[PDB]
Design a binder for this molecule. Structure first.
Ligand SMILES: Nc1ncnc2c1ncn2[C@@H]1O[C@H](COP(=O)(O)OP(=O)(O)O)[C@@H](O)[C@H]1O
Length: 416
């Protein structure tokens, strides 16, 4: 099961800047003999003038934690292959786009750089960065090799850069002969953790990678390294330098955890209204299990005079992005959401979490990951868990068992 694409898109639509990470980058140089090399500025990388111009113009002062290690590896001569894993928002897309723009020679009117995205909508996000960093390349044009593109059989395309989805790209490189694969200098496999979702996407990617010149630079980027992601990368990127950055560790040290005992949904709703009655609820998210519950809760709250924003799956991703952004600006004080709609999403400016229903997995057990990632976000936070059965009480006790910190009982009416 992979809702992966949607989540990856939403995270991009709302991302405004680099996520802060304090762990150190792990580099496994292809040759264990050769030393490690890092940079601390773009100038140190002797970039093509107009490319450097584009980099500053889009607001980048210096390379990010991950770029410090990737850029030099990618700009090495002769071109080395790279597998880079790091959580989203750490500068992976800016990196390989910089890589592509370095190798691309606008003089030559054929595809020189090829990037595979898992979906057209994600392709457009990469496409956005390219148009922006390479805005001082006059003759640089972009092509989308996607199922939607209605290109009629004919001559080869003249765009120096192609982005697209495995299925369409393979055809363009073979059957429909829109691209000469042997002329590709740089091949990027983006969002590997998302592309493994379809068995089809894997096989197609591999079969494309095999048509490339053997000295083509292969770059594969990924947020996570599940065993499946790893064994796939090994099949796509031969002789790889490997960059790994450990995901930031969420911390419940600065957070107050409560739970309220209830007997029905109607009581959970009253506990919550009481909570509004006591403290001013703002910058808060309320998590429900089903879309049915979320829309009901939001309707009931509105009726009680509380304005809330709903975040459920019937909304297009762009709509969820607009809501989330209003929530960040403080235009919205409270966000009601289903679990799935918020899973993995890096919503910012959240001081208060209300688990209207407790987070569980497909089976029925405590979803410790999701809990920690919600609550964790030395800044003070509030977390309130609504328990409404002996069963959901068990879940809470098992959550309080996993972590070794107590969830203090909170009496509905007594909230001093
Ligand atoms: N060197 C840099 N300096 C400042 N900001 C950057 C730099 N590289 C990327 N960013 C910004 O950080 C955010 C994450 O970049 P991105 O490459 O999209 O992350 P990823 O591809 O790893 O998900 C984006 O908003 C991007 O504009």
């Amino acid at each position: 099961m992979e809702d992966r694409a949607a989540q990856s898109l939403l995270n991009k639509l709302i991302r405004s800047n680099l996520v802060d990470n304090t762990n150190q980058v792990e580099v496994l140089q292809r040759d264990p003999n050769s030393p490690l090399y890092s940079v601390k500025s773009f100038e140190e990388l002797r970039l093509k003038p107009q490319l450097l111009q584009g980099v500053y113009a889009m607001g980048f002062n210096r390379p990010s934690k991950i770029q410090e290690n990737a850029l030099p590896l990618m700009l090495a001569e002769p071109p080395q292959n790279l597998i880079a894993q790091s959580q989203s928002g750490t500068g992976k897309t800016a990196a390989f786009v910089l890589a592509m723009l370095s190798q691309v020679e606008p003089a030559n009117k054929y595809p020189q750089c090829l990037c595979l995205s898992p979906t057209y909508e994600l392709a457009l996000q990469t496409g956005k960065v390219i148009e922006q960093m390479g805005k001082f390349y006059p003759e640089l044009k972009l092509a989308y090799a996607v199922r939607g593109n209605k290109l009629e059989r004919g001559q080869k395309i003249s765009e120096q850069i192609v982005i697209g989805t495995p299925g369409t790209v393979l055809d363009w490189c073979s059957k429909l002969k829109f691209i000469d694969p042997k002329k590709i200098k740089v091949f990027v496999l983006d969002e590997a953790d998302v592309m493994i979702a379809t068995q089809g996407h894997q096989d197609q990617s591999i079969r494309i990678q095999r048509m490339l010149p053997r000295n083509c630079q292969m770059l594969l980027f990924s947020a996570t390294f599940e065993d499946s992601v790893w064994k796939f990368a090994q099949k796509v990127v031969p002789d790889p330098n490997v960059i790994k950055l450990k995901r930031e560790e969420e911390t419940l040290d600065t957070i107050k955890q409560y739970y309220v005992l209830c007997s029905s949904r109607d009581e959970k709703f009253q506990a919550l209204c009481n909570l509004y009655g006591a403290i001013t609820i703002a910058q808060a998210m309320i998590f429900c299990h089903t879309r049915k519950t979320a829309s009901w809760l939001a309707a009931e709250l509105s009726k009680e005079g509380h304005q809330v924003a709903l975040l459920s799956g019937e909304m297009m991703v762009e709509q969820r992005a607009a809501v989330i952004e209003r929530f960040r600006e403080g235009k919205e004080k409270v966000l009601v959401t289903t679990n799935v709609c918020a899973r993995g999403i890096d919503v910012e400016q959240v001081s208060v979490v209300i688990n209207f229903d407790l987070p569980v997995d497909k089976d029925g057990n405590p979803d410790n990951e999701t809990y920690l990632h919600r609550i964790g976000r030395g800044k003070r936070g509030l977390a309130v868990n609504m328990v409404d059965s002996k069963h959901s009480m068990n879940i809470l006790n098992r959550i309080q068992e996993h972590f070794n910190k107590k969830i203090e009982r909170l009496d509905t009416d007594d909230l001093d």
